[PDB]
Chains A and B, each alone.
Chain A
Amino acid sequence: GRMHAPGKGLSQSALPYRRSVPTWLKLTSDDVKEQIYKLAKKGLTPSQIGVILRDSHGVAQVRFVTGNKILRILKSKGLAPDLPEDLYHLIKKAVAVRKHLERNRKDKDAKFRLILIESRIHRLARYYKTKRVLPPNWKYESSTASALVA
Protein backbone atom coordinates (compact mmCIF):
# COMPACT_ATOMS: atom_id res chain seq x y z
CA GLY A 1 0.00 0.00 0.00
CA ARG A 2 0.94 3.65 -0.30
CA MET A 3 3.15 5.01 2.45
CA HIS A 4 1.07 8.12 3.18
CA ALA A 5 -2.29 7.27 1.61
CA PRO A 6 -4.95 4.62 2.14
CA GLY A 7 -4.47 3.46 -1.44
CA LYS A 8 -3.41 0.03 -2.64
CA GLY A 9 -2.89 0.57 -6.33
CA LEU A 10 -1.04 -2.03 -8.36
CA SER A 11 0.11 0.00 -11.39
CA GLN A 12 3.67 -1.08 -12.14
CA SER A 13 5.92 -1.99 -15.06
CA ALA A 14 6.15 -5.61 -16.20
CA LEU A 15 9.64 -6.24 -17.50
CA PRO A 16 9.72 -9.01 -20.14
CA TYR A 17 11.40 -12.31 -19.43
CA ARG A 18 13.91 -11.90 -22.29
CA ARG A 19 16.91 -9.81 -21.28
CA SER A 20 18.30 -10.16 -24.81
CA VAL A 21 18.53 -7.07 -27.01
CA PRO A 22 16.01 -7.13 -29.88
CA THR A 23 17.46 -7.93 -33.29
CA TRP A 24 15.89 -4.78 -34.77
CA LEU A 25 17.82 -2.53 -32.37
CA LYS A 26 20.87 -1.22 -34.21
CA LEU A 27 22.19 1.09 -31.50
CA THR A 28 25.13 -0.32 -29.57
CA SER A 29 26.46 0.32 -26.07
CA ASP A 30 28.65 3.32 -26.84
CA ASP A 31 26.04 4.92 -29.12
CA VAL A 32 23.39 4.69 -26.42
CA LYS A 33 25.93 6.00 -23.90
CA GLU A 34 26.63 9.09 -26.00
CA GLN A 35 22.91 9.64 -26.47
CA ILE A 36 22.53 9.53 -22.68
CA TYR A 37 25.46 11.93 -22.32
CA LYS A 38 23.89 14.52 -24.61
CA LEU A 39 20.48 14.18 -22.95
CA ALA A 40 22.09 14.70 -19.54
CA LYS A 41 23.96 17.72 -20.90
CA LYS A 42 20.58 19.00 -22.07
CA GLY A 43 19.70 18.66 -18.40
CA LEU A 44 17.28 15.77 -18.04
CA THR A 45 16.87 13.54 -15.01
CA PRO A 46 17.61 9.82 -15.52
CA SER A 47 13.89 8.99 -15.53
CA GLN A 48 13.27 11.48 -18.33
CA ILE A 49 16.33 10.19 -20.19
CA GLY A 50 14.98 6.65 -20.08
CA VAL A 51 11.49 7.77 -21.10
CA ILE A 52 12.75 9.78 -24.09
CA LEU A 53 15.15 7.03 -25.14
CA ARG A 54 12.48 4.32 -25.06
CA ASP A 55 9.79 6.46 -26.68
CA SER A 56 11.85 7.67 -29.64
CA HIS A 57 14.92 5.47 -30.18
CA GLY A 58 13.32 2.07 -29.68
CA VAL A 59 15.58 1.00 -26.81
CA ALA A 60 13.65 -1.14 -24.34
CA GLN A 61 15.99 -1.19 -21.34
CA VAL A 62 19.22 0.77 -21.16
CA ARG A 63 20.58 -1.76 -18.68
CA PHE A 64 19.74 -4.62 -21.04
CA VAL A 65 21.49 -2.82 -23.90
CA THR A 66 24.64 -1.44 -22.26
CA GLY A 67 25.15 -3.52 -19.11
CA ASN A 68 24.76 -0.55 -16.76
CA LYS A 69 21.99 1.69 -15.48
CA ILE A 70 21.50 5.32 -16.48
CA LEU A 71 22.61 6.66 -13.11
CA ARG A 72 25.62 4.34 -13.12
CA ILE A 73 26.63 5.62 -16.56
CA LEU A 74 26.19 9.24 -15.50
CA LYS A 75 28.23 8.65 -12.35
CA SER A 76 30.95 6.88 -14.32
CA LYS A 77 31.45 9.73 -16.77
CA GLY A 78 30.91 12.34 -14.05
CA LEU A 79 27.93 14.48 -15.09
CA ALA A 80 25.28 13.34 -12.63
CA PRO A 81 23.79 15.66 -9.98
CA ASP A 82 24.97 15.44 -6.39
CA LEU A 83 21.38 15.47 -5.14
CA PRO A 84 19.44 12.28 -5.95
CA GLU A 85 16.60 12.89 -8.38
CA ASP A 86 13.77 11.63 -6.18
CA LEU A 87 15.02 13.62 -3.19
CA TYR A 88 15.33 16.68 -5.43
CA HIS A 89 11.74 16.36 -6.61
CA LEU A 90 10.57 15.82 -3.03
CA ILE A 91 12.22 19.01 -1.78
CA LYS A 92 10.86 20.81 -4.84
CA LYS A 93 7.33 19.72 -3.96
CA ALA A 94 7.82 20.76 -0.34
CA VAL A 95 9.15 24.15 -1.45
CA ALA A 96 6.09 24.67 -3.64
CA VAL A 97 3.74 23.65 -0.82
CA ARG A 98 5.44 25.95 1.70
CA LYS A 99 5.36 28.82 -0.81
CA HIS A 100 1.63 28.24 -1.26
CA LEU A 101 1.08 28.05 2.51
CA GLU A 102 2.86 31.31 3.36
CA ARG A 103 0.21 33.03 1.20
CA ASN A 104 -2.73 30.75 2.15
CA ARG A 105 -2.14 29.85 5.80
CA LYS A 106 -5.78 28.80 6.26
CA ASP A 107 -5.09 25.74 4.07
CA LYS A 108 -5.07 23.17 6.85
CA ASP A 109 -5.08 20.53 4.11
CA ALA A 110 -1.91 22.04 2.66
CA LYS A 111 -0.30 22.05 6.11
CA PHE A 112 -1.17 18.36 6.48
CA ARG A 113 0.27 17.50 3.07
CA LEU A 114 3.37 19.51 3.93
CA ILE A 115 3.86 17.37 7.03
CA LEU A 116 3.54 14.24 4.90
CA ILE A 117 6.03 15.48 2.29
CA GLU A 118 8.53 16.54 4.95
CA SER A 119 8.29 13.08 6.51
CA ARG A 120 9.03 11.48 3.14
CA ILE A 121 11.98 13.84 2.65
CA HIS A 122 13.46 13.01 6.04
CA ARG A 123 13.07 9.25 5.62
CA LEU A 124 14.67 9.34 2.17
CA ALA A 125 17.50 11.50 3.49
CA ARG A 126 18.06 9.06 6.35
CA TYR A 127 18.41 6.21 3.86
CA TYR A 128 20.83 8.19 1.70
CA LYS A 129 22.89 9.13 4.75
CA THR A 130 23.24 5.48 5.73
CA LYS A 131 24.27 4.64 2.17
CA ARG A 132 26.84 7.50 2.15
CA VAL A 133 25.25 9.21 -0.84
CA LEU A 134 24.67 12.27 1.30
CA PRO A 135 27.17 13.76 3.75
CA PRO A 136 26.57 12.64 7.34
CA ASN A 137 25.74 16.22 8.36
CA TRP A 138 23.36 16.94 5.46
CA LYS A 139 20.28 18.48 7.07
CA TYR A 140 17.04 19.42 5.36
CA GLU A 141 15.71 22.77 6.56
CA SER A 142 12.45 24.57 5.89
CA SER A 143 14.50 27.74 5.32
CA THR A 144 17.36 26.31 3.25
CA ALA A 145 15.18 24.15 0.97
CA SER A 146 14.38 27.03 -1.39
CA ALA A 147 18.08 27.70 -1.88
CA LEU A 148 18.93 24.01 -2.19
CA VAL A 149 16.40 23.39 -4.98
CA ALA A 150 16.47 25.94 -7.82
Chain B
Amino acid sequence: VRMNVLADALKSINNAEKRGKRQVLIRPCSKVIVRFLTVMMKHGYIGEFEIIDDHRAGKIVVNLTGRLNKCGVISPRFDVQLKDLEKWQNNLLPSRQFGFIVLTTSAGIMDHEEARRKHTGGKILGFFF
Protein backbone atom coordinates (compact mmCIF):
# COMPACT_ATOMS: atom_id res chain seq x y z
CA VAL B 1 0.00 0.00 0.00
CA ARG B 2 0.98 3.67 -0.09
CA MET B 3 3.38 4.18 2.80
CA ASN B 4 5.44 7.21 1.66
CA VAL B 5 3.31 10.02 0.27
CA LEU B 6 6.41 12.20 -0.15
CA ALA B 7 8.15 9.49 -2.16
CA ASP B 8 5.14 9.13 -4.44
CA ALA B 9 4.93 12.91 -4.93
CA LEU B 10 8.61 13.16 -5.81
CA LYS B 11 8.48 10.25 -8.24
CA SER B 12 5.43 11.78 -9.95
CA ILE B 13 7.19 15.13 -10.32
CA ASN B 14 10.32 13.41 -11.64
CA ASN B 15 8.34 11.51 -14.28
CA ALA B 16 6.43 14.59 -15.42
CA GLU B 17 9.67 16.57 -15.65
CA LYS B 18 11.27 13.84 -17.75
CA ARG B 19 8.21 13.80 -20.01
CA GLY B 20 8.25 17.58 -20.40
CA LYS B 21 4.76 18.20 -19.03
CA ARG B 22 4.05 21.79 -18.03
CA GLN B 23 1.97 20.79 -14.98
CA VAL B 24 1.59 17.74 -12.79
CA LEU B 25 -0.96 16.61 -10.21
CA ILE B 26 0.08 14.91 -6.98
CA ARG B 27 -3.02 13.22 -5.62
CA PRO B 28 -2.22 12.94 -1.88
CA CYS B 29 -1.10 16.20 -0.26
CA SER B 30 0.76 16.56 3.03
CA LYS B 31 2.36 19.28 5.10
CA VAL B 32 5.76 17.74 4.38
CA ILE B 33 4.95 17.78 0.66
CA VAL B 34 3.98 21.44 0.87
CA ARG B 35 7.17 22.35 2.75
CA PHE B 36 9.39 20.34 0.38
CA LEU B 37 7.78 22.00 -2.63
CA THR B 38 8.18 25.35 -0.88
CA VAL B 39 11.94 25.00 -0.56
CA MET B 40 12.11 23.86 -4.20
CA MET B 41 10.00 26.90 -5.10
CA LYS B 42 12.21 29.33 -3.20
CA HIS B 43 15.29 27.97 -4.92
CA GLY B 44 13.42 28.26 -8.22
CA TYR B 45 13.37 24.64 -9.40
CA ILE B 46 9.57 24.74 -9.80
CA GLY B 47 6.99 27.46 -10.33
CA GLU B 48 3.68 28.20 -8.67
CA PHE B 49 1.67 25.34 -7.23
CA GLU B 50 -1.92 24.95 -6.12
CA ILE B 51 -3.42 22.98 -3.22
CA ILE B 52 -6.83 21.72 -4.29
CA ASP B 53 -8.81 21.41 -1.07
CA ASP B 54 -11.19 18.53 -0.90
CA HIS B 55 -12.36 17.49 2.53
CA ARG B 56 -10.00 14.52 2.31
CA ALA B 57 -6.24 14.79 1.88
CA GLY B 58 -5.99 17.46 -0.77
CA LYS B 59 -4.31 17.42 -4.16
CA ILE B 60 -1.52 19.59 -5.56
CA VAL B 61 -0.94 20.90 -9.08
CA VAL B 62 2.63 22.12 -9.54
CA ASN B 63 3.96 24.04 -12.53
CA LEU B 64 7.26 22.65 -13.78
CA THR B 65 9.75 25.26 -14.98
CA GLY B 66 11.81 22.71 -16.89
CA ARG B 67 14.91 23.22 -14.73
CA LEU B 68 14.73 20.09 -12.57
CA ASN B 69 17.09 17.17 -13.09
CA LYS B 70 16.21 14.85 -10.21
CA CYS B 71 14.04 15.28 -7.12
CA GLY B 72 14.40 11.92 -5.42
CA VAL B 73 13.64 10.90 -1.85
CA ILE B 74 15.54 9.17 0.95
CA SER B 75 12.79 6.98 2.34
CA PRO B 76 14.35 5.75 5.61
CA ARG B 77 14.56 9.12 7.36
CA PHE B 78 18.06 8.76 8.74
CA ASP B 79 19.41 10.79 11.62
CA VAL B 80 21.97 13.20 10.18
CA GLN B 81 24.34 15.31 12.26
CA LEU B 82 26.37 18.35 11.35
CA LYS B 83 29.51 16.21 11.43
CA ASP B 84 28.30 13.74 8.78
CA LEU B 85 26.09 16.02 6.67
CA GLU B 86 28.91 16.59 4.17
CA LYS B 87 29.20 12.86 3.47
CA TRP B 88 25.54 12.90 2.48
CA GLN B 89 26.31 15.95 0.34
CA ASN B 90 29.08 14.09 -1.49
CA ASN B 91 26.99 10.94 -1.88
CA LEU B 92 23.87 12.66 -3.20
CA LEU B 93 24.51 16.09 -4.70
CA PRO B 94 25.99 16.18 -8.22
CA SER B 95 28.46 18.92 -7.31
CA ARG B 96 29.35 21.38 -4.60
CA GLN B 97 28.22 24.32 -6.75
CA PHE B 98 24.51 23.46 -6.86
CA GLY B 99 22.00 20.92 -5.64
CA PHE B 100 20.23 20.68 -2.31
CA ILE B 101 19.56 18.10 0.38
CA VAL B 102 16.32 18.73 2.26
CA LEU B 103 16.09 17.71 5.90
CA THR B 104 13.50 18.23 8.61
CA THR B 105 14.95 19.71 11.79
CA SER B 106 13.37 21.06 14.94
CA ALA B 107 13.72 24.52 13.37
CA GLY B 108 11.57 23.40 10.44
CA ILE B 109 11.99 21.82 7.03
CA MET B 110 14.94 23.37 5.23
CA ASP B 111 17.84 22.67 2.92
CA HIS B 112 21.26 21.57 4.09
CA GLU B 113 22.95 24.94 3.59
CA GLU B 114 20.38 26.70 5.78
CA ALA B 115 20.59 23.89 8.32
CA ARG B 116 24.36 24.37 8.49
CA ARG B 117 23.90 28.14 8.72
CA LYS B 118 21.64 27.84 11.77
CA HIS B 119 23.73 24.97 13.18
CA THR B 120 21.26 22.10 13.46
CA GLY B 121 20.82 18.58 12.16
CA GLY B 122 17.77 16.45 11.64
CA LYS B 123 16.22 13.77 9.44
CA ILE B 124 17.01 13.68 5.74
CA LEU B 125 13.86 13.84 3.60
CA GLY B 126 15.20 13.95 0.06
CA PHE B 127 17.21 15.90 -2.46
CA PHE B 128 16.77 17.92 -5.61
CA PHE B 129 19.17 19.31 -8.19
Contact = CB atoms under 8 A, between A and B. Distances in A.
A137 to B, nearest CB: 32
Interface residues of A, number: 3
Nearest to A1: B1
Interface residues on B, range: under 10
Contacts of B55: 15, 17, 19
Name the prevailing secondary structure of the A interface residues. loop
B84 interface: no
Interface in B36-89: 54-55
Contacts of A15: 55
A19 B55 CA distance: 9
A17 B53 CA distance: 10
A100 to B, nearest CB: 33
Interface string A5-25: 000000000010101000000
A15 B54 CA distance: 10
Nearest to B55: A17
Contacts of A17: 54-55
A148 to B, nearest CB: 32
A144 B54 CA distance: 46
A9 to B, nearest CB: 15
Contacts of B54: 17
Closest 3 CB pairs of A and B: A17-B54, A17-B55, A19-B55
Interface of A: 15, 17, 19
